[PDB]
Design a protein around this motif. Structure first.
Motif, PDB file in Angstrom:
ATOM      1  N   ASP A 105      78.817 -40.781  48.490  1.00  0.00           N
ATOM      2  CA  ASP A 105      80.111 -41.378  48.812  1.00  0.00           C
ATOM      3  C   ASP A 105      81.240 -40.462  48.222  1.00  0.00           C
ATOM      4  OD1 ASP A 105      80.918 -43.583  50.262  1.00  0.00           O
ATOM      5  OD2 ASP A 105      81.297 -44.921  48.513  1.00  0.00           O
ATOM      6  N   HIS A 159      85.495 -40.084  48.422  1.00  0.00           N
ATOM      7  CA  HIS A 159      86.722 -40.611  48.963  1.00  0.00           C
ATOM      8  C   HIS A 159      87.954 -39.799  48.540  1.00  0.00           C
ATOM      9  CE1 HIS A 159      84.691 -43.871  50.749  1.00  0.00           C
ATOM     10  NE2 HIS A 159      84.344 -44.478  49.629  1.00  0.00           N
ATOM     11  N   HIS A 163      89.647 -49.607  52.370  1.00  0.00           N
ATOM     12  CA  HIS A 163      88.380 -49.580  51.657  1.00  0.00           C
ATOM     13  C   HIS A 163      88.487 -49.858  50.125  1.00  0.00           C
ATOM     14  CE1 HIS A 163      84.129 -48.503  51.180  1.00  0.00           C
ATOM     15  NE2 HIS A 163      84.432 -47.552  50.311  1.00  0.00           N
ATOM     16  N   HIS A 201      86.318 -45.918  43.746  1.00  0.00           N
ATOM     17  CA  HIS A 201      85.043 -45.403  43.257  1.00  0.00           C
ATOM     18  C   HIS A 201      84.831 -44.045  43.961  1.00  0.00           C
ATOM     19  CE1 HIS A 201      84.315 -47.735  46.938  1.00  0.00           C
ATOM     20  NE2 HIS A 201      83.332 -46.877  47.206  1.00  0.00           N
TER      21      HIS A 201
HETATM   22 FE   FE2 Z   1      82.851 -46.194  49.279  1.00  0.00          FE
END
Ligand code: FE2
Length: 185
Positions: A49, A51, A57, A71
């Motif tokens: 993941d 970002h 989100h 996160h």
């Molecule tokens: Fe995520």
């Protein structure tokens, strides 16, 4: 022909992290040393993941269903591999969620253009084993996408960490009904 896919074994998903899954730290070291014992993989890859700006989100008032605390933010420690977890064996890393919430490893792209399924087929991979975090979220979603996309698929259940017992049960049942094979490693 067979590859292992290590899903989201990252700081923010282990003890201390913004989305801590109890058993995450222990799981990182169980995966290393597997890798060291068996093995029997033509290829080994990981997903992360990752970002930059995923909009809705993230939220200050998160619901842990469609909105989350921040996160795996690019340029922070949360986004890195947990420091247990030998990285030696990993041939490619697939990043997903740069501008969007991501659900499946099959949304990831490696550092050149390359989507996960493309990288795998170019190497004649036709069957995958899936391990990592969380059993009830991205592991489940990555396993059922493997099957939708025509790959023979196992989850090595002893090498996953799920968020809750009740949701992990529901997830393991939905994986069988989609035709994933659930075994110990
Ligand atoms: Fe995520």
């Amino acid at each position: 022909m067979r590859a292992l896919i290590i899903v989201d074994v990252q700081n923010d998903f282990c003890e201390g992290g913004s989305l801590a899954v109890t058993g995450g730290a222990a799981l990182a070291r169980a995966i290393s040393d597997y890798l060291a014992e068996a093995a029997d993989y033509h290829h080994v890859v990981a997903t992360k993941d990752f970002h930059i700006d995923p909009g809705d989100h993230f939220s200050g008032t998160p619901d842990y269903s469609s909105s989350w605390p921040p996160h795996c933010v690019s340029g922070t420690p949360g986004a890195d591999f947990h420091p247990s977890l030998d990285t030696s064996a990993i041939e490619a890393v697939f990043y997903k969620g740069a501008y969007t919430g991501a659900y499946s490893g099959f949304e990831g792209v490696d550092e050149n253009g390359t989507p996960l399924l493309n990288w795998l087929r170019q190497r004649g991979v036709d069957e995958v084993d899936v391990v990592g975090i969380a059993t009830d979220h991205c592991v489940r979603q990555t396993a059922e996408d493997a099957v939708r996309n025509g790959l023979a698929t196992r989850v090595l259940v002893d090498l996953t960490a799920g968020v809750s017992a009740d949701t992990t049960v529901a997830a393991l049942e939905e994986m069988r009904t989609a035709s994933v094979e659930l075994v110990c490693s």
